[PDB]
Write a protein that holds these residues in place. Structure first.
Motif, PDB file in Angstrom:
ATOM      1  N   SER A 182       0.847  -1.182   0.000  1.00 48.53           N
ATOM      2  CA  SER A 182       0.000   0.000   0.000  1.00 48.53           C
ATOM      3  C   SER A 182       0.886   1.235   0.000  1.00 48.53           C
ATOM      4  CB  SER A 182      -0.896   0.018   1.231  1.00 48.53           C
ATOM      5  OG  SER A 182      -0.144   0.347   2.392  1.00 48.53           O
ATOM      6  N   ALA A 184       0.454   3.700   1.867  1.00 47.50           N
ATOM      7  CA  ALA A 184       0.658   4.018   3.274  1.00 47.50           C
ATOM      8  C   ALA A 184       1.958   3.409   3.790  1.00 47.50           C
ATOM      9  CB  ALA A 184      -0.539   3.544   4.101  1.00 47.50           C
ATOM     10  N   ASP A 185       2.068   2.075   3.759  1.00 47.17           N
ATOM     11  CA  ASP A 185       3.259   1.421   4.303  1.00 47.17           C
ATOM     12  C   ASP A 185       4.524   1.898   3.607  1.00 47.17           C
ATOM     13  OD1 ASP A 185       1.252  -0.232   5.685  1.00 47.17           O
ATOM     14  OD2 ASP A 185       2.914  -1.648   5.997  1.00 47.17           O
TER      15      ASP A 185
HETATM   16 CA   LIG Z   1      -2.014  -0.061   5.805  1.00 47.60          CA
END
Ligand SMILES: [Ca+2]
Ligand SMILES: [Ca+2]
Lengths: 211, 224
Positions: A182, A184-185
């Motif tokens: 993702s 995000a990560d």
């Molecule tokens: Ca996540």
């Protein structure tokens, strides 16, 4: 029905070697025997009809032998572009049935991989996924080991890899690893590393980038 | 000269029917047979039948009881093959070939020129074309004056996609890898090429991604 059985399923030889595949029919099929070569990806190609008739074009290192229920294809000096699977075909009675194929692999000297790494395109990042790609290019033999590491931490998922068929000109393989996060990560971390083990390397090789 | 060119890949649902073309050139269509043979991914070649481009006579394989139909159209030098009531185990590459099988029974019997193949996937899932991302050459992609660049063909169903570079002009150094299955059931692949890093600002590199089961056709310009 006539069952064709080829007698090495798999074999590896060295450039210049003489190689012989064996095909055996379940009933007398006379001299109605065909040989096809199938380089990976491409369609089959006729090489020999009627046991030993070379098709014009087909190099003369290929030969056919036998009558009755035992037939032999001989490659007298194996070439790198002879990497392929070979099928026999009985042309005696309908249905013309095929052999199960003989995979034929070329052996060559050890070659160590060229390791590359590709950060995700900003394009891909807009959509909220990040795929990181590591490339092991033109190595031999085939066994290599990729580990992904994020901030020197062994990753354990979202990994897929693929390896090519053997190269027609230089007999090597290539491997492509993808680590997919993702977005995000991917932005929770700094250092992304690809760690490659292969026998032509003294110790594991690490290619890496900073996000 | 003598070439058989086939219809592109297709995905059909269980129970549907599929019809694969095969157009000939560079030989006399009416004076040979056309034979179809299928290859399931992983294990081996199977005769389906053949048709006379002169008589129109067909001889089918027994298993395919009344599911396969082979026709020819003389004016178009094209042969057709229909497979009705499709099963999940009908997924294969479907070849056509020119077959010599005359009234004179000799041992010169064979299939030669084969078509490049048609992959027919049978599945209940919906086609999805792919997104094409660039893999850009950088210092992290340079080993001894040689750069590597690629394209990342991500998230498509079914197989196959085809990649080319510079519309077929660039081929030495290219690697298109077997596709992987994602945790999601959608395939992806990558295609890379190695080039001299000297000629990076001087050469343009474009990957031509064709996924015909979605009639998608992305070109991506890959740049440092
Ligand atoms: Ca996540
Ligand atoms: Ca930070």
């Amino acid at each position: 029905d006539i069952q064709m059985t080829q007698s090495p399923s798999s074999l590896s030889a060295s450039v210049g070697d003489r190689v012989t595949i064996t095909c055996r029919a379940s009933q007398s099929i006379s001299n109605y025997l065909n040989w096809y070569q199938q380089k990976p990806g491409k369609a089959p190609k006729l090489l020999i009809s009627a046991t030993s008739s070379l098709q014009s074009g087909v190099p003369s290192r290929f030969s056919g032998s036998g009558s009755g229920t035992d037939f032999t294809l001989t490659i007298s000096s194996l070439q790198p572009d002879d990497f392929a699977t070979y099928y026999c075909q009985q042309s005696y009675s309908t249905p013309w049935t095929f052999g199960q194929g003989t995979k034929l692999e070329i052996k060559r000297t050890v070659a160590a991989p060229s390791v590359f790494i590709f950060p995700p395109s900003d394009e891909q990042l807009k959509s909220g996924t990040a795929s990181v790609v590591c490339l092991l290019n033109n190595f031999y033999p085939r066994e290599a080991k990729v580990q992904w590491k994020v901030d020197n931490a062994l990753q354990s998922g979202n990994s897929q890899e693929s390896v090519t068929e053997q190269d027609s000109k230089d007999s090597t393989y290539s491997l492509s690893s993808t680590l997919t996060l993702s977005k995000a990560d991917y932005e929770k971390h700094k250092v992304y590393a690809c760690e490659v083990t292969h026998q032509g390397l003294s110790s594991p090789v690490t290619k890496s980038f900073n996000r | 000269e003598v070439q058989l060119v086939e219809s592109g890949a297709e995905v059909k649902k269980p129970g549907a029917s599929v019809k694969v073309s095969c157009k000939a050139s560079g030989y006399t269509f009416t004076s040979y047979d056309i034979t179809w043979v299928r290859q399931a991914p992983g294990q081996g070649l199977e005769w389906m039948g053949w048709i006379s481009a002169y008589n129109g006579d067909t001889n089918y394989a027994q298993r395919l009881q009344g599911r396969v139909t082979m026709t020819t159209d003389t004016s178009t030098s094209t042969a057709y093959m229909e497979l009705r009531s499709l099963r999940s185990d009908d997924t294969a590459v479907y070849y056509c070939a020119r077959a010599k099988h005359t009234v004179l029974v000799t041992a010169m019997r064979w299939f030669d020129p084969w078509g490049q193949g048609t992959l027919v996937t049978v599945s209940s899932a919906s086609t999805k074309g792919p997104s094409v991302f660039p893999l850009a050459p950088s210092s992290k992609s340079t080993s001894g004056g040689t750069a590597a660049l690629g394209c990342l063909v991500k998230d498509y169903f079914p197989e196959p996609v085809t990649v080319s570079w510079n519309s077929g002009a660039l081929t030495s150094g290219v690697h298109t890898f077997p596709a992987v299955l994602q945790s999601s059931g959608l395939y992806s692949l990558s295609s890379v090429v190695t080039v001299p890093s000297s000629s990076l600002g001087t050469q343009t590199y474009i990957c031509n991604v064709n996924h015909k089961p979605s009639n998608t056709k992305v070109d991506k310009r890959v740049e440092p």
